[PDB]
Write an enzyme that holds these catalytic residues in place. Structure first.
Site, short mmCIF file in Angstrom:
data_model
loop_
_atom_site.label_atom_id
_atom_site.label_comp_id
_atom_site.label_asym_id
_atom_site.label_seq_id
_atom_site.Cartn_x
_atom_site.Cartn_y
_atom_site.Cartn_z
N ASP A 119 0.84 -1.16 0.00
CA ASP A 119 0.00 0.00 0.00
C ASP A 119 0.88 1.21 0.00
OD1 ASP A 119 -2.51 1.60 0.39
OD2 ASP A 119 -1.50 1.89 2.36
N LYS B 206 -7.01 32.44 -2.26
CA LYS B 206 -6.24 31.77 -1.19
C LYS B 206 -4.89 32.40 -0.87
CE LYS B 206 -5.47 27.21 0.93
NZ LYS B 206 -4.34 27.70 1.77
N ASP C 5 -1.63 -0.31 5.73
CA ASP C 5 -1.85 0.66 6.79
C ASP C 5 -3.31 0.60 7.26
OD1 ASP C 5 -2.97 1.76 4.50
OD2 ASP C 5 -2.40 3.82 4.94
N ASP D 84 -7.01 -1.97 3.22
CA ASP D 84 -6.16 -3.14 3.07
C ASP D 84 -6.69 -4.30 3.91
OD1 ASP D 84 -4.74 -1.30 1.64
OD2 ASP D 84 -3.21 -1.00 3.19
MG LIG Z 1 -2.27 3.74 2.56
#
Ligand SMILES: [Mg+2]
Ligand SMILES: CCCCCCCC/C=C\CCCCCCCC(=O)OC[C@H](COP(=O)(O)OC[C@H](N)C(=O)O)OC(=O)CCCCCCC/C=C\CCCCCCCC
Ligand SMILES: C[C@@H]1O[C@@H](O[C@H]2C[C@@H](O)[C@]3(CO)[C@H]4[C@H](O)C[C@]5(C)[C@@H](C6=CC(=O)OC6)CC[C@]5(O)[C@@H]4CC[C@]3(O)C2)[C@H](O)[C@H](O)[C@H]1O
Ligand SMILES: CCCCCCCCCCCCOCCOCCOCCOCCOCCOCCOCCOCCO
Ligand SMILES: CCCCCCCCCC(=O)OC[C@@]1(O[C@@H]2O[C@H](CO)[C@@H](O)[C@@H](O)[C@H]2O)O[C@H](CO)[C@H](O)[C@@H]1O
Ligand SMILES: CCCCCCCCCC(=O)OC[C@H]1O[C@H](O[C@]2(CO)O[C@H](CO)[C@@H](O)[C@@H]2O)[C@H](O)[C@@H](O)[C@@H]1O
Ligand SMILES: *[C@@H]1O[C@H](CO)[C@@H](O[C@@H]2O[C@H](CO)[C@@H](O)[C@H](O)[C@H]2NC(C)=O)[C@H](O)[C@H]1NC(C)=O
Ligand SMILES: CC(C)CCC[C@@H](C)[C@H]1CC[C@H]2[C@@H]3CC=C4C[C@@H](O)CC[C@]4(C)[C@H]3CC[C@]12C
Ligand SMILES: CC(C)CCC[C@@H](C)[C@H]1CC[C@H]2[C@@H]3CC=C4C[C@@H](O)CC[C@]4(C)[C@H]3CC[C@]12C
Ligand SMILES: *[C@@H]1O[C@H](CO)[C@@H](O)[C@H](O)[C@H]1NC(C)=O
Ligand SMILES: *[C@@H]1O[C@H](CO)[C@@H](O)[C@H](O)[C@H]1NC(C)=O
Ligand SMILES: [Mg+2]
Ligand SMILES: [Mg+2]
Lengths: 996, 32, 289
Positions: free
Chosen positions: A349, A460, A690, A694
């Site tokens: 990931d 901004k 993480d 996943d």
């Molecule tokens: Mg991730």
């Protein structure tokens, strides 16, 4: 019908998100300003279920101890024990000795199953405990609006379709459809994988509800701003809940090591029943009644079973796992230690796994030059040259104009991992200045802020004006940051090396292509500018407010750009390097945006430099993207958009024909599909992760790996291994460790399996040539579970025979743990030399005691008869029962000792598969000790007082000890030249037939 | 008489051996 | 998966090279066998052709019975001819070696005393001397028990009788207990040259004592004459007849089973409590009618 349920769970989601607010509330029966009525709210709350996920459906009771007691190996020992018990039962056909024999044995088998079971159980338990200690769930109360009144209630009490307000820092209580927002950036990092905080608005943006801005998600924290929304989804029905339930609902799959052991068992039981049956027939072909033939059948089979090797394998694995834990790499499951070694594909990931998931200063623009900062968590990189004054000015600009300030308790903490109250970019910048330039505390309070303009909803730009701290010139200092194009619109003067200049299009466009280059690099860029003020026009006492133009917002002095991205973890790039080096294929699977995904990929080395995607080719060559032949592209970035329309053959092709792959913008379900897709290739997949996306992936992988800290709870639960220190480099050590423990297992196994020849053969030729039984059941046990234990464990401490991280990953079909070669060695060659040694000792003892070997034939019939007390030896002497039986037992002891002697040689040659012992050497200390303790033990059992009473083991006359000696030396010398020939000729016939 | 064997002495040897053999094993695994 | 039986071209499992391996294992196992026989051969060089290399295992010789029973037990009907037939035949073949026409030769047989006599030492245990003569044993020495052709012949048919024999040990020279005999019950004064034996109901506690016992030995002494010792081993003395001594139970309670133990006394003699046949003897007899 739960198949169907999961079938709807592997499908990516839908929504109502695109609706006129009129139609939204029309549908949900709610007021947008007032929320809904308290009666209605409690009516729904008790209509379905409170806002919370159904606790993990799994709560296996400690009755799960039972699990450890079966598997397949403990099964082998179980059926063994049962067979012995049946045999003794059959030996209740008479008045029968097994009171010390068959029941003894079956009970022992049972003991080994139960004890090894308890040990492995305790280990997995211990891991579960240390995981429980990590569980901290704080209640976060949601802010609702009902009957027009704002009420803060327990989040579990939130229902479908009531107005909710979220603020800076608030966690999104349930799935919302944003109706209104102000400057609102939610953090979607773990759920969709999006790295930078995505802003949220009333307006519909993307067809796919996950990428749209008008929906907010359960379990995501709002980073900043505020927003209101109607609750679309409550509890399990939410997005992260659907993910979580899919994850709970998946299957582990058989671990590679477990399979190798299954096959191993198939071999062992194969020879077991071949011997048992062939000898059953053979025994019938002679005399013995079906009774005796059946007893022999059960005998030979049960004897083929390695009782010790179940312990020695479990201990082996446990040792390796201990080292893992020492490195802060924890394995939930015990056989999960090997899997990395067998892995040919790592699906990883991006954010939180490969990267830090923390916005950090990456590159800076000084003197029309790009200087890269140190993006590492530990500061292991290279510092820029901070001597220049331009950097000083810049650093003061970034440090002074911010809302970013360190929180109350961050002092002792490292400046990076420490918390900060502020924006994403402001946090990155604050940490950067506090690091490189020294403290921003006295620095920000040095200049006193008069009036500031916070980020405007449009354009901004953010400016602020301070007084002068220097001693020379006392003019007011003005500072502003904002998007490069807008600030380029408002800037004229440019600064270099401490002196000013106007803008020329040469260096103006140098700044332009530097901005487009850094922007293209995946990073986010911010324009930083300042202007001193004409204090003659603006005196020391002038109070300027935010009403009219006080300061010349134009003709300012543009200093430079500061760019930022979430960097890879320090350890990452080298690690992916090593995994690629070991021949493991690294695939990035992320839900993030492709533009950043590709950049991070190139950064960690998943896409090597110089490797072109289809689109890189199309771009360089100035052609339609469709034109180029995809074979010409080694690397590919696959948009999840297409991944929805993809078939089996298509994904199979993508994985086949591309070496460096990045799947970007991919839903959790699709992560699962990619993993399953790499598994269709018949390859071992490891997943590293993480967050919650996943979850289904990490579960489905042959081995999942979570992150102990930056990992979420569902995916940690789904993982088969956890990294407590969050170090990616551990993966590498993992693949090394598991790769090594494979080899050593072979050795251990081989060693133990060699002993079944000199163990089984005595009872074999006992039935065949009718000689007195050379080796008993108690002796055999003293070998299997007594002596060989320490050596067989010590073998696990063997080291790498060559560089293992050099060699390619093993092939599950081809390369086997226990294979036809190993059996051809253990049973075929070495075991035989052992058996011969044993029988030689036997005959030396009996011949010396007066029974010459030739005369020993057929003798057993009378020998084993309790009532024949005149029994002629070769010298004409007459032996009683107990006398000659004492010689038989004092013939069992030296057979046992002899086994030990030949297991010296066997243990030294089993130490190395290829290397000659003169190379790898005796550096193994446990092994030495094993030899000493082993011999000491055998010596003890022979000579300890009353052991002839207890075990029917008698003291050896000293000369006995040496009978085995030449046979051991033969074993050593034999294998050494085999392992010489194999080195010299790696063709090779010896290598093909033997090397195992 | 040839019908007597100093088993007690060989018994003693083997034991004294097993004693050194073990504690030399222990020195070995404890390398400091 | 396992359907690899035969195809082009490998015999199940793989049959290309089968010759090579088989040849290998033929060579290999050949060599192993050779080596084994080698070690067994030198081992066989080291055993003496005359005396065994270790005698310490047979040290206390045991006492054995004529009709070795299933478990030390003669249980039989005085009437049924087939009741005692097994025992009778056992004795019959046992003493078939002892008949006077069986020891014919004066070349290999020697007539020793009609009265117990001092041990007969023949040289040393080597072959320098010829094959040794063997002392004769005439069945008349046990009277009323196998009696030549003269009685019993029911061999106990009326009342039970069992010959006890001493275990053969090469070189063993029995030393009978001193004339300072520590309470050996009722025995003759022929202690000088006889290994004595005596029978009892139970060992050393209360007994169901029911027995009258008559003994037949050489010249009338209830034991083994020393003249037949030492034994020179099967090589130096084949056809060697060892001493036999008979014990008849005349008075016994018929339909009850009672146990008997026969101990042989001497310094050269020993008893083990684990081996009930070492130095001593046990027999359970029930004559039921
Ligand atoms: Mg991730
Ligand atoms: C670890 C390596 C251990 C030492 C290895 C060497 C070793 O074992 O040597 C043998 C000695 C034993 O002595 P000996 O038996 O040879 O003495 C002679 C005789 N038994 C007597 O006591 O009268 O054994 C010991 O007692 C020991
Ligand atoms: C000639 C033969 O000898 C006696 O019995 C024989 C069969 C059986 O009784 C046993 C004990 O039970 C068998 C038993 O079955 C299987 C074993 C436990 C087996 C092992 C498995 C293992 O893992 O380790 C060893 C191999 C031999 C074994 O060790 C013993 C050996 C002693 C023996 O006693 C031998 C009886 O007198 C019988 O009637 C007569 O036929
Ligand atoms: C104490 C044990 C001693 C006894 C055993 C003696 C061993 C005798 C083995 C008999 C030979 C069996 O056949 C093997 C050779 O088959 C044909 C191959 O010939 C060359 C092989 O020579 C030895 C192997 O070394 C590696 C071979 O590499 C060269 C390639 O060879 C061809 C392989 O096919
Ligand atoms: C290599 C050395 C081999 C030498 C040898 O066997 O040594 C003779 C040895 O053995 C004695 O001699 C006997 C002679 O029959 C043997 O049968 C033994 O049973 C025993 O009574 O005596 C030594 C002291 O213990 C030595 O260590 C070994 O124990
Ligand atoms: C005979 C039975 C084993 C013999 C043996 O293994 O010898 C090699 C030993 O020598 C060792 O040291 C090394 C191994 O690194 O061996 C070489 C010594 O010349 C050299 O290559 C290197 O210094 C250690 O003593 C042992 O562990 C190692 O077994
Ligand atoms: C052997 O058996 C004979 C019987 O055939 C016994 O002879 C008897 O002896 C008793 C004295 O004990 C006399 O009263 C009888 O008249 C004898 N009868 C016969 C027929 O001889 C003889 O006693 C037995 N001997 C031994 C030692 O038991
Ligand atoms: C690595 C190689 C050389 C192994 C050498 C170890 C040998 C020489 C050792 C290991 C076990 C030892 C024996 C154990 C039993 C004792 C009984 C004692 O009363 C005399 C010696 C004797 C018989 C020992 C002789 C030496 C012995 C056989
Ligand atoms: C050439 C070398 C390496 C060894 C060859 C083996 C032969 C020649 C030797 C070496 C080991 C020897 C044996 C080891 C010790 C026993 C025990 C003893 O009670 C009698 C001798 C006997 C039986 C030996 C006979 C000969 C033997 C088998
Ligand atoms: C034993 O003592 C008796 C007298 O008590 C005597 O007649 C006999 O000869 C002695 N025998 C021996 C061998 O001393
Ligand atoms: C044998 O026993 C019987 C009865 O038990 C007894 O009458 C008889 O006298 C005994 N015979 C003897 C002592 O010779
Ligand atoms: Mg798993
Ligand atoms: Mg075994």
């Amino acid at each position: 019908k739960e198949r169907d349920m999961d079938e709807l769970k592997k499908e990516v989601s839908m929504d109502d998100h695109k609706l006129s607010l009129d139609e939204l509330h029309r549908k949900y029966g709610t007021d947008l300003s007032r929320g809904l009525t308290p009666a209605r709210a409690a009516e729904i709350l008790a209509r379905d279920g409170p806002n919370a996920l159904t606790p993990p459906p799994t709560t296996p009771e400690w009755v799960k101890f039972c699990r450890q007691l079966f598997g397949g190996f403990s099964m082998l020992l179980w059926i063994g024990a049962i067979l012995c018990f049946l045999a003794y039962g059959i030996q209740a056909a008479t008045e029968e000795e097994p009171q010390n024999d068959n029941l003894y044995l079956g009970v022992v088998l049972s003991a080994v199953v139960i004890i090894t079971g308890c040990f492995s159980y305790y280990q997995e338990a211990k891991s579960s405990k240390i995981m429980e200690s990590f569980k901290n769930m704080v209640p976060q109360q949601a802010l609702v609006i009902r009957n027009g009144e704002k009420m803060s209630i327990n989040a579990e009490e939130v229902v479908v379709g009531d107005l909710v307000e979220v603020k800076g820092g608030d966690r999104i209580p349930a799935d919302l459809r944003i109706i209104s927002a102000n400057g609102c950036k939610v953090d979607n990092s773990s759920l969709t994988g999006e790295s930078e905080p995505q802003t949220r608005s009333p307006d519909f943006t993307n067809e796919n509800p996950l990428e749209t801005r008008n929906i907010a998600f359960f379990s995501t924290n709002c980073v900043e701003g505020t927003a209101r929304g109607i609750v679309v989804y409550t509890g399990d029905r939410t997005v992260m809940g659907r993910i979580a339930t899919l994850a709970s609902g998946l299957e582990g799959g058989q671990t590679p090591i477990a399979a190798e052991i299954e096959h191993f068992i198939h071999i062992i039981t194969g020879v077991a029943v071949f011997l048992g049956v062939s000898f059953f027939i053979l025994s019938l072909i002679l005399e013995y009644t079906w009774l005796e033939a059946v007893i022999f059948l059960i005998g030979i089979i049960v004897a083929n079973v390695p009782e010790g090797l179940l312990a020695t394998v479990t201990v082996c694995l446990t040792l390796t796992a201990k080292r893992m834990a020492r490195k802060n790499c924890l394995v939930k499951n015990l056989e999960a230690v090997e899997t990395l070694g067998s892995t040919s594909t790592i699906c990883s990931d991006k954010t939180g796994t490969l990267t830090q998931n923390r916005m950090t200063v990456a590159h800076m623009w000084s003197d029309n030059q790009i200087h890269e900062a140190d993006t590492t968590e530990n500061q292991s990189g290279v510092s820029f040259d901070k001597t220049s004054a331009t950097w000083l000015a810049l650093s003061r600009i970034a440090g002074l104009c911010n809302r970013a300030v360190f929180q109350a308790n961050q002092e002792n903490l490292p400046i990076l991992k420490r918390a900060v109250a502020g924006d994403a970019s402001e946090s990155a910048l604050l940490k950067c200045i506090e690091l490189c330039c020294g403290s921003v505390k006295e620095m920000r309070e040095r200049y006193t802020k008069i009036v500031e303009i916070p980020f405007n909803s449009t354009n901004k730009y953010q400016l602020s004006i301070h007084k002068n701290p220097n001693t020379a010139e006392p003019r007011h200092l003005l500072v502003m940051k904002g998007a490069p194009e807008r600030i380029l619109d408002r800037c004229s003067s440019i600064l270099i090396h401490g002196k000013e200049q106007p803008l020329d299009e040469e260096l103006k466009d140098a700044f332009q292509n530097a901005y487009l280059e850094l922007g293209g690099l995946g990073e986010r860029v911010l324009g930083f500018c300042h202007l001193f003020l004409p204090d003659e026009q603006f005196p020391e006492g002038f109070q300027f407010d935010t009403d009219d133009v006080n300061f010349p917002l134009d003709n300012l002095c543009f200093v430079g750009l500061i760019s930022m991205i979430d960097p890879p973890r320090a350890a990452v790039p080298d690690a992916v390097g090593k995994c690629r080096s070991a021949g493991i294929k690294v695939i990035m699977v992320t839900g993030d945006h492709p533009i950043t995904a590709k950049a991070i990929a190139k950064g960690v080395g998943i896409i090597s430099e110089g490797n072109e995607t289809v689109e890189d080719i199309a771009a360089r060559l100035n052609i339609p993207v469709s034109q180029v032949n995809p074979r010409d592209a080694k690397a590919c970035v696959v948009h999840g958009s297409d991944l929805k329309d993809m078939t089996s053959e298509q994904l199979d092709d993508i994985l086949k024909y591309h070496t460096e792959i990045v799947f970007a913008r991919t839903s959790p379900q699709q992560k699962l599909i990619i993993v399953e897709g790499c598994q269709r290739q018949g390859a071992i997949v490891a997943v590293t992760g993480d967050g919650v996306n996943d979850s289904p992936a990490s579960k489905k992988a042959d081995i999942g790996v979570a992150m102990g800290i930056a990992g979420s709870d569902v995916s940690k639960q789904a993982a088969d291994m956890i990294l407590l220190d969050d170090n990616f480099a551990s993966i590498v050590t993992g693949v090394e460790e598991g790769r090594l423990i494979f080899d050593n297992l072979k050795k251990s196994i081989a060693y133990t399996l060699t002993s079944n020849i000199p163990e089984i053969t005595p009872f074999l030729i006992f039935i065949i040539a009718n000689i007195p039984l050379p080796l008993g059941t108690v002796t055999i046990l003293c070998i299997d579970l007594g002596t060989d234990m320490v050596p067989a464990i010590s073998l696990a401490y063997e080291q790498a025979e060559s560089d293992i991280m050099k060699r390619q990953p093993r092939n599950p079909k081809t390369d086997k743990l226990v294979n036809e070669q190993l059996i051809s060695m253990a049973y075929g060659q070495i075991g035989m030399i052992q058996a011969l040694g044993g029988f030689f000792t036997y005959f030396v003892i009996l011949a010396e005691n007066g029974f010459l070997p030739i005369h020993l034939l057929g003798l057993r019939v009378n020998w084993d008869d309790r009532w024949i007390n005149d029994v002629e030896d070769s010298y004409g002497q007459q032996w009683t029962y107990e006398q000659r039986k004492i010689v038989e037992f004092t013939c069992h002891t030296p057979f046992f000792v002899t086994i030990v002697v030949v297991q010296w040689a066997d243990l030294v040659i089993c130490k190395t598969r290829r290397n000659s012992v003169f190379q790898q050497g005796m550096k193994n200390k446990i092994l030495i000790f094993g030899l000493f303790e082993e011999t000491a033990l055998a010596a003890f059992l022979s000579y300890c007082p009353g052991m002839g009473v207890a075990l029917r083991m008698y003291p050896l006359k000293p000369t006995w000890w040496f009978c085995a000696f030449p046979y051991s030396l033969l074993i050593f010398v034999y294998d050494e030249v085999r392992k010489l020939i194999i080195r010299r000729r790696p063709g090779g016939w010896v290598e093909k037939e033997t090397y195992y | 008489d040839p019908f007597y064997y100093d088993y007690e002495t060989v018994r003693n040897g083997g034991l004294i051996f097993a004693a050194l053999a073990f504690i030399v094993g222990l020195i070995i695994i404890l390398s400091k | 998966f396992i359907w690899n039986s035969e195809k082009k071209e490998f015999l199940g499992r793989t049959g290309g090279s089968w010759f090579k391996i088989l040849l290998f294992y033929v060579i290999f196992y050949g060599c192993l066998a050779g080596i084994f026989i080698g070690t067994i051969q030198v081992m066989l060089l080291t055993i003496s052709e005359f005396k065994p290399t270790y005698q310490d295992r047979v040290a206390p010789p045991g006492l054995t019975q004529i009709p070795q029973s299933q478990k030390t037990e003669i249980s039989f009907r005085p009437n049924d001819p087939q009741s005692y037939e097994s025992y009778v035949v056992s004795i019959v073949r046992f003493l078939e070696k002892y008949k006077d026409l069986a020891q014919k030769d004066d070349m290999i047989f020697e007539d020793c005393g009609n009265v117990p006599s001092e041990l007969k030492e023949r040289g040393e245990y080597n072959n320098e001397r010829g094959e040794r003569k063997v002392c004769r044993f005439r069945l008349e020495w046990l009277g009323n028990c196998s009696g030549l052709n003269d009685e019993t012949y029911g061999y106990k048919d009326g009342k039970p009788c069992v010959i006890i024999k001493l275990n053969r040990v090469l070189g063993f020279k029995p030393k009978p207990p001193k004339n300072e005999s520590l309470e050996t019950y009722p025995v003759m004064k022929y202690n000088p040259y006889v290994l004595p034996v005596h029978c009892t109901g139970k060992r050393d506690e209360d007994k169901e004592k029911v027995g009258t016992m008559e003994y037949f030995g050489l010249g009338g002494y209830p034991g083994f004459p020393l003249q037949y010792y030492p034994y020179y081993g099967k090589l130096l003395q084949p056809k060697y007849l060892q001493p036999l001594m008979a014990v008849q139970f005349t008075n016994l309670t018929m339909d009850t089973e009672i146990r008997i133990e026969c101990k042989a006394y001497g310094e050269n003699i020993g008893y083990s409590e684990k081996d009930r046949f070492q130095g001593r003897f046990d027999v359970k007899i029930e004559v039921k009618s």
